[PDB]
Amino acid sequence: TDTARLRAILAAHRGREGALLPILHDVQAAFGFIPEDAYAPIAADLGLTRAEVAGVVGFYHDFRKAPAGRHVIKLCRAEACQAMGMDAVQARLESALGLRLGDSSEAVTLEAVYCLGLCACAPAAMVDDRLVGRLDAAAVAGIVAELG
Amino acid sequence: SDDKIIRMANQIAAFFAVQPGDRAGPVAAHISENWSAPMRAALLAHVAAQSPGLDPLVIAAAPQIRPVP
Amino acid sequence: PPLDWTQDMGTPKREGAPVHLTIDGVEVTVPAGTSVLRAAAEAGISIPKLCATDNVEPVGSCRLCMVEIEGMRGTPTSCTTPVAPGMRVHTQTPQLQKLRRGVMELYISDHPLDCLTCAANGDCELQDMAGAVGLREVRYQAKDTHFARRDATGPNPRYIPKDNSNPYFSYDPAKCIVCMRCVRACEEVQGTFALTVMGRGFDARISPAAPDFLSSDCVSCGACVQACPTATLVEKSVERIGTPERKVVTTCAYCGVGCSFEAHMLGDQLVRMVPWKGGAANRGHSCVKGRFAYGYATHQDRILKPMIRDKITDPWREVNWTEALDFTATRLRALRDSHGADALGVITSSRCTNEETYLVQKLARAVFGTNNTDTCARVCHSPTGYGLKQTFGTSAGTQDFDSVEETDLALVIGANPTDGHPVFASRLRKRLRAGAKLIVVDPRRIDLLNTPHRGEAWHLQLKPGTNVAVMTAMAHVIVTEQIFDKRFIGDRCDWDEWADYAEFVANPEYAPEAVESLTGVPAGLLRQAARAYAAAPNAAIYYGLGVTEHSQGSTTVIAIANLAMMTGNIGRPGVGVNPLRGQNNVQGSCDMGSFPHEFPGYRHVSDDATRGLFERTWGVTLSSEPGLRIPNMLDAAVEGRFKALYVQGEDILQSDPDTRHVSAGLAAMDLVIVHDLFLNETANYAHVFLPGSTFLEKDGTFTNAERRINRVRRVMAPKAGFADWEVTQMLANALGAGWHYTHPSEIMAEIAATTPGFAAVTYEMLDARGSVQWPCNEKAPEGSPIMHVEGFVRGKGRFIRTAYLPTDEKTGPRFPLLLTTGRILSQYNVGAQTRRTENTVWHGEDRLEIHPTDAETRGIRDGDWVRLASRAGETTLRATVTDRVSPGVVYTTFHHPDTQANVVTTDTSDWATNCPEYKVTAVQVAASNGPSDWQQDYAAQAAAARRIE
Numbered sequence A: 001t002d003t004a005r006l007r008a009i010l011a012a013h014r015g016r017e018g019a020l021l022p023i024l025h026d027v028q029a030a031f032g033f034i035p036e037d038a039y040a041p042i043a044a045d046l047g048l049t050r051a052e053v054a055g056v057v058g059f060y061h062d063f064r065k066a067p068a069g070r071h072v073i074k075l076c077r078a079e080a081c082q083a084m085g086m087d088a089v090q091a092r093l094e095s096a097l098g099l100r101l102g103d104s105s106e107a108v109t110l111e112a113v114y115c116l117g118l119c120a121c122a123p124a125a126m127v128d129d130r131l132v133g134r135l136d137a138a139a140v141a142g143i144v145a146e147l148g
Numbered sequence B: 001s002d003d004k005i006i007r008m009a010n011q012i013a014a015f016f017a018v019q020p021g022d023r024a025g026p027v028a029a030h031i032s033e034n035w036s037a038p039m040r041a042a043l044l045a046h047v048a049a050q051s052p053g054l055d056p057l058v059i060a061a062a063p064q065i066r067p068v069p
Numbered sequence C: 001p002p003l004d005w006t007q008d009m010g011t012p013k014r015e016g017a018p019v020h021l022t023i024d025g026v027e028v029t030v031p032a033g034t035s036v037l038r039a040a041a042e043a044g045i046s047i048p049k050l051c052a053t054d055n056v057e058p059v060g061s062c063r064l065c066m067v068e069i070e071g072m073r074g075t076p077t078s079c080t081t082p083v084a085p086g087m088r089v090h091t092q093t094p095q096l097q098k099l100r101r102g103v104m105e106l107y108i109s110d111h112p113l114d115c116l117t118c119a120a121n122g123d124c125e126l127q128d129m130a131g132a133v134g135l136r137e138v139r140y141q142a143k144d145t146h147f148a149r150r151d152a153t154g155p156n157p158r159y160i161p162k163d164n165s166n167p168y169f170s171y172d173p174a175k176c177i178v179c180m181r182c183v184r185a186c187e188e189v190q191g192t193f194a195l196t197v198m199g200r201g202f203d204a205r206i207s208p209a210a211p212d213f214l215s216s217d218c219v220s221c222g223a224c225v226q227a228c229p230t231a232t233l234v235e236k237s238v239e240r241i242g243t244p245e246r247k248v249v250t251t252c253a254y255c256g257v258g259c260s261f262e263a264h265m266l267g268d269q270l271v272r273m274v275p276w277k278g279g280a281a282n283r284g285h286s287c288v289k290g291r292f293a294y295g296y297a298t299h300q301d302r303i304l305k306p307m308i309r310d311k312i313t314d315p316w317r318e319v320n321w322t323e324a325l326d327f328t329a330t331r332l333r334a335l336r337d338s339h340g341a342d343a344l345g346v347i348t349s350s351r352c353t354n355e356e357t358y359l360v361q362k363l364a365r366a367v368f369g370t371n372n373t374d375t376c377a378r379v380c381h382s383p384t385g386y387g388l389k390q391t392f393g394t395s396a397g398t399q400d401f402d403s404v405e406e407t408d409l410a411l412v413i414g415a416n417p418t419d420g421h422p423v424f425a426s427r428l429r430k431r432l433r434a435g436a437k438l439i440v441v442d443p444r445r446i447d448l449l450n451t452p453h454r455g456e457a458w459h460l461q462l463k464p465g466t467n468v469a470v471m472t473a474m475a476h477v478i479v480t481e482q483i484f485d486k487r488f489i490g491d492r493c494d495w496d497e498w499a500d501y502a503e504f505v506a507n508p509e510y511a512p513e514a515v516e517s518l519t520g521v522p523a524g525l526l527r528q529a530a531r532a533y534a535a536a537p538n539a540a541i542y543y544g545l546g547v548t549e550h551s552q553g554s555t556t557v558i559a560i561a562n563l564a565m566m567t568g569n570i571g572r573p574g575v576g577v578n579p580l581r582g583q584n585n586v587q588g589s590c591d592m593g594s595f596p597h598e599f600p601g602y603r604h605v606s607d608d609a610t611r612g613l614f615e616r617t618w619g620v621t622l623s624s625e626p627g628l629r630i631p632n633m634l635d636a637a638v639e640g641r642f643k644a645l646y647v648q649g650e651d652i653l654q655s656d657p658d659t660r661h662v663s664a665g666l667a668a669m670d671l672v673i674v675h676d677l678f679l680n681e682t683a684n685y686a687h688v689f690l691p692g693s694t695f696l697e698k699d700g701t702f703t704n705a706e707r708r709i710n711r712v713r714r715v716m717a718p719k720a721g722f723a724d725w726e727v728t729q730m731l732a733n734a735l736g737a738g739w740h741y742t743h744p745s746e747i748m749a750e751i752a753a754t755t756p757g758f759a760a761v762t763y764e765m766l767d768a769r770g771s772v773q774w775p776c777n778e779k780a781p782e783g784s785p786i787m788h789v790e791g792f793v794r795g796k797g798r799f800i801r802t803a804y805l806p807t808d809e810k811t812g813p814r815f816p817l818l819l820t821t822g823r824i825l826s827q828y829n830v831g832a833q834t835r836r837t838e839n840t841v842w843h844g845e846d847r848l849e850i851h852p853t854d855a856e857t858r859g860i861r862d863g864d865w866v867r868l869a870s871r872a873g874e875t876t877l878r879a880t881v882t883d884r885v886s887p888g889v890v891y892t893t894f895h896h897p898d899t900q901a902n903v904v905t906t907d908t909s910d911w912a913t914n915c916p917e918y919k920v921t922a923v924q925v926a927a928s929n930g931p932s933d934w935q936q937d938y939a940a941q942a943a944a945a946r947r948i949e
C-alpha cells in the first residue's frame, strides 16, 4: 500500500506551483523518509527527472534518507541556548541514552536543530513534537523517564 | 497474381483521379517521366492486350505515354 | 575569423544595442546584455575564469573573475555583471590579485597534486587559472579532503571510488571543483537532466541518481566531459593515449545534421573528437556516435586489400589493385556487349561525399552509358522530393536549424529527433523549455514528448497508415473555421485552386468526427491541435519517415505542404516544412544525380538543353531515358535483363525490404561489385570487393539536411592507400574513360561549372565563411539560409486535393497486429560501423516493443523469445512489454543482422517514388523457442561465404 498512498499524495498536490517541496513533506510525513522507490513517480507526475528529485531531497535536512528511532530528540546548538549551558544538557542526556550527538539508533535519535524560538528559555529541546525549555540537569530525568 | 507494373499504374491512377482538370494527361506524363523503356513497353503491351485488373484512366492515358524506341 | 571559435568566451552572446565601455584602458563596443567578461575577452584583455562557459549561463561559483568597477562597492564578478555605458573597470588591481590568490588557495587545498601524472595535463582549466593568478603557496594543512583515500585513523568517508562504467568516459570526483559546469551543460544544452549536486556544502558532490553513469539517464553525449575543466569527467582515450597536440575540422558521418567536429590529434593517432563551436547545425554539441564512435576505422575486421572471387560459392582471394580492376572491367565489358549498357547499374552512397557521388553518376552515365543509378534516397525521403517538388518546386528543406530558435510551435509528424537527430532535439527542447508548444502525431510515445520542464503538449496517438486522414481533418477544421491567412494565399499562392481545395476539404466526410473510427485519435483533441497550430504566430512542421515511408507518402507530404502554405508558415525564420533528412549527404547525393531520372541539379534527363551541356562537358553521348530503381533493378534481375551492379557504400540486403526477394535478385546477377570498408551482408553475394575510405581519410564535402555544405578534411592517411573517388576513377580509367583528378577541388569546380547553385562554391569559401547553403550563385553569394522568402521557386504555390486511401496492408485474423520499424540513439541503421564499437552496451540485441494487453493473451513476457509470423517471411526476436506503443501495434529495430527484420517487410510501396512500406506490416506475434527457418539459412550462407583464402 505504498503506491496507493503516493498516488493519493500526488493527486492531492496536483496543479500547484512548485509542488515538489510540499509533496516531499507529505511523503516524509506518511512513511518517515523519502524512499528511493519514490523518486521516480514524483518526478514523472511533476515532469521532473530522478536527478532533480534526488538533489532536492539531498539539499534539505528535514527530509530523512533513512528512518529514525521510536523517539527523536532535537537539541539546539545555537548561540543563545549554548550560552545557558546546552553542552551540559547534551552531555548528561547522551550519557543517559548512550548516544552522542548525531548518533542515532532504533530506540532514539539525538540531533541538532540550531533554533526552536525558545531563545529566552535558553536550554531548549524538541522531544517527539513536544517542545521543552529551561532544561536543567533535572528535567533530563523526566525527559528520559517518559522516553524509554 | 498482380503484375508489379499494373499495380504501380493503378496506384498512380488512384492518386491522380481525385485531382481537378485533366486527370489522364498528368498520369501519362508521370509514367513517361519516371518509368524506363522495358517498363513502358510492358505497360503499353498490357493496355493494348486488355489485361484485367487495370484502371480505365490508365487505359485512356496510355496513348499519351512517351513512345518507346 | 570569429573569436567564438578559437577562444572560449565567458558568457553566451546577447542581442541588443551598442554599448561602449572601457576595459582596463581599452575601448570596447558590445551589446547591452553582454557581460564584462565576454567584452574583456573580445577586447583581448583576459580575466581569470573557471566556472563560466559560452555553452551555458553564468553562475557566481568561482569568484575568480572579480573586477573593481568605479561606482560599485567591493569586487563584483564580471560573469554576472552586465555592462553599462561609460563604465570604467579595472581588471587587475593589487587587492584583486590577493583575493584571486586566496580563492585558488582554497581550491587547491582540496585538490590532489596529481599534475604531471593526470590525464588533463595541458588541457586543464584549473591548472592554467592557478598558474595565471600566480599561486605560490598553500597554507592550509587540510585534514578534511575528498581525494585522500586513507585519512587519519582510517578510510576517508568523503572519498568516492572512480567510475569507469561508461566505456567512453570516467568520473573521478576526487578532483572535482564543484563549479557545476557538468550539471549546467547536461541541463541547459543536452536537455536530459541526469546530473545533480547531491549534498549541501563541502559535502556537495556531483552525481547521477544511480550507482554508475551507465545505469542512469545518460545518453553519452559528452557535454559534461567537454565542459569539465579538471579531469574529473575525462575521456578514456585521453587516459590511454597522451593529451593531443593539433586539431582538424571534420564532420560526422551520421544523421544528416552535419555536426562539425574537431579531431584532436597526436601525430596520426586520433585521440578524441570534440565539437568546434562552429556550424549552425551544432553550436558545440554532439551525441554518442559522432563524439565517441569512431573506432570502426581502427577495427581489425576492416578489409584493406581488393578481393576477387569469380563465384560466390568459391572463397575470396586477397589480390592487388591492377588485376582486380582488370577482371572487373573485363567482366563488365563482356556483360555490356552481351546484354547492353542498360544491363548495368550503380548504387551510390549518401555516406560518401558529393564528389564521389558525382564521379559515380558519371561512371554510370558517361562510361557505362546508362541512366540506371540510385541511392538510399529511394527507401527514405524520396516522396519528400516529389511532394515538395509538386507543390513548391524544390525537392529540399525550407529552413535551417537556427530557425527553431525563433519558432513558437513545433508540429512533429513521423519523427523521433531524440534518437534520429539528437542535436536537433536538443535545440528543440531548448525552446520547449522556453514556452513553445508541441504537437506529436506519432502512434508511439516518443521521448521528445516526455522531455523535462516541458511546456504544453498534444499527442495524436493514431494508427499507422492513417497519416493523411489526420492532415485532411486538420485542413477541414481550419477551413470550416476561418483561421487561415488569406493575405498569404493571395500574395504567394493561387486563389482559383484554393477555392476548389476548400470546397473539397470542406466536405463533412473528411471531418475529425468521422475519422475517429478509422484513425483512432479523439476528435476534440484533434480540433484543439489544429486550432493551436493555426492560431500560433510562427509554427513549424518537422517531418520524417512516418510520412514518407508509406503506401501514401508523397500524398501525405503534399497535404503537409498544403497545411504549411494555407496557414502561412513559410518564408520566414521560425516557420517552414522541414524534412529531417537521414544519412549524411543524402541531400548532396540527390543533388549530384544519384537518381535514375535526373542530372546533377534536379534537372530531368529528357531535358535537351541540359543533355547538350553535359554531352559538351563530358564529350560523350548520353541517354534521354530515365533509369531503373532498386525495386525495378531486383525485379528485373529476377526476370533477367540485368546482370551487373556496382554497390557503393550501401547494404542492399539488410537495409532493404523483402530480404528473400532481394536476395534472390542479387543472386541472379553475373556481377555485383562491393565498395565498402567492411565485409557486409551484401558482400555475401558479391563476386568482387574494393576497400573504401572513412571520413577521416577522405577529403571533400557533405551536404546535410539544411542544405548546408560542410567541409571534410583529411586527418589520417588511407589505410587501403586510396580514397573512394580514387578507386572510382581507377575503375573508370580502367574501363576507358580517361579521367585525371588529383584532388576533389577540380571535381567541385567541375560540379560548379556544370550545375547552378554550386556555381560560387569553392573550398576557399567553405574555409573562410565555414559553411554554405548550396543555393549560392552570383545572386545570393553568401547563401540562402531560408527558402521561399520572396515568392516560391515555381512562382506560385499549388493546392492539391489529397485523400485517404485504405492501405493494402490491412490486418486480418491470421495477421491481427500491425508492425513498425525504427531506430535507437546508440546504433546506426545497419550498424556495420557502430556494432564494431562500444555502443553495443546500450543496444546489443534488437527487441520487440509489444503492448502488455497484447502480451497476456499470447503469453509473452519481457525477455521472452517470440516469432513474427508475417506474410512475406518469418523471424524471431526478444520481446519487451511496454505501454509506449498502442494496442494492436508493434515496434522493431533493424540495427542488428542476427535478426533479419526486413524479411518480414512487404514489397508494398509508395506510388510515385516507390519508397517501401517499412512502417506498416500485418504481423502475428507468438511465443516460440526455435529462432527461425530463415535466420538459420542466412547464418549458414554468411558463414560459408565470408571465408577468405
Ligand SMILES: Nc1nc2c(c(=O)[nH]1)N[C@H]1C(S)=C(S)[C@@H](COP(=O)(O)OP(=O)(O)OC[C@H]3O[C@@H](n4cnc5c(=O)[nH]c(N)nc54)[C@H](O)[C@@H]3O)O[C@H]1N2
Residues within 6 Å of the ligand: C253, C349, C351, C352, C376, C377, C379, C380, C545, C582, C583, C648, C649, C650, C651, C652, C654, C655, C656, C675, C676, C677, C678, C680, C691, C692, C693, C694, C695, C724, C821, C822, C828, C829, C830, C831, C832, C833, C894, C901, C902, C905, C918
Ligand atoms: N525495417 C527498416 N528498414 C530500413 C529503414 C527503416 O526505417 N526500417 N530505413 C531505410 C533508410 S532510412 C536508409 S538510410 C537505409 C540505411 O542503411 P544503408 O543503406 O545500409 O547504409 P549504412 O547504414 O551507412 O551501411 C551500409 C554500408 O556502407 C558502408 N560505409 C559507411 N561509410 C562509408 C564510407 O565513407 N565510404 C564507403 N566506400 N563505404 C561506407 C557501411 O560501413 C556499411 O557496410 O536503411 C533502410 N532500411
Ligand SMILES: Nc1nc2c(c(=O)[nH]1)N[C@H]1C(S)=C(S)[C@@H](COP(=O)(O)OP(=O)(O)OC[C@H]3O[C@@H](n4cnc5c(=O)[nH]c(N)nc54)[C@H](O)[C@@H]3O)O[C@H]1N2
Residues within 6 Å of the ligand: C254, C255, C256, C289, C380, C413, C414, C415, C416, C417, C419, C420, C421, C441, C442, C443, C444, C446, C463, C464, C465, C466, C467, C543, C544, C545, C546, C547, C550, C580, C581, C582, C583, C820, C821, C822, C823, C824, C825, C826, C827, C828, C829, C919
Ligand atoms: N542514433 C541514430 N541516428 C540516426 C539513425 C539511426 O539509425 N540511429 N538513422 C538515420 C536515417 S538514414 C534516417 S532516415 C533519419 C530519420 O529518422 P526519423 O525521421 O526519426 O524516423 P524513425 O526513427 O525511423 O521513426 C519515425 C517515428 O514515427 C512513427 N510512425 C510509424 N508509423 C507512423 C504513421 O503512419 N504516421 C505517423 N505520423 N507516424 C508514424 C515511428 O513509429 C517512429 O516513432 O535519421 C538518421 N539518424
Ligand code: SF4
Residues within 6 Å of the ligand: C111, C112, C113, C114, C115, C116, C118, C119, C120, C121, C122, C124, C125, C126, C127, C175, C229, C230, C231, C232
Ligand atoms: S585536473 Fe588539472 S589540476 Fe587537477 S591533477 Fe589533473 S591536470 Fe592537475
Ligand code: SF4
Residues within 6 Å of the ligand: C182, C185, C186, C190, C192, C194, C195, C217, C218, C219, C220, C221, C222, C223, C224, C225
Ligand atoms: S554525457 Fe551528455 S547526457 Fe551524459 S551526463 Fe554528460 S552532458 Fe549529460
Ligand code: SF4
Residues within 6 Å of the ligand: C175, C176, C177, C178, C179, C180, C181, C182, C183, C206, C224, C227, C228, C229, C230, C232, C233
Ligand atoms: S565534474 Fe567537472 S564540471 Fe562538474 S562540478 Fe566537478 S569539476 Fe565542475
Ligand code: SF4
Residues within 6 Å of the ligand: C252, C253, C254, C255, C256, C257, C258, C259, C282, C286, C287, C288, C289, C290, C291, C420, C421, C422, C423, C424
Ligand atoms: S549522429 Fe547526427 S547528431 Fe549525432 S554527431 Fe552525427 S550528425 Fe551530430
Ligand code: FES
Residues within 6 Å of the ligand: A076, A077, A078, A079, A080, A081, A082, A114, A115, A116, A117, A118, A119, A120, A122, A124
Ligand atoms: S537559539 Fe536555540 S532557542 Fe533560538
Ligand code: FES
Residues within 6 Å of the ligand: C037, C048, C049, C050, C051, C052, C058, C059, C060, C061, C062, C063, C064, C065, C077, C078, C079, C080
Ligand atoms: S568567474 Fe564569473 S563567476 Fe565564476
Ligand SMILES: [Mo+6]
Residues within 6 Å of the ligand: C376, C380, C581, C582, C583
Ligand atoms: Mo535514411
Ligand SMILES: [S]
Residues within 6 Å of the ligand: C350, C376, C377, C380, C381, C581, C582, C583, C586
Ligand atoms: S536516407
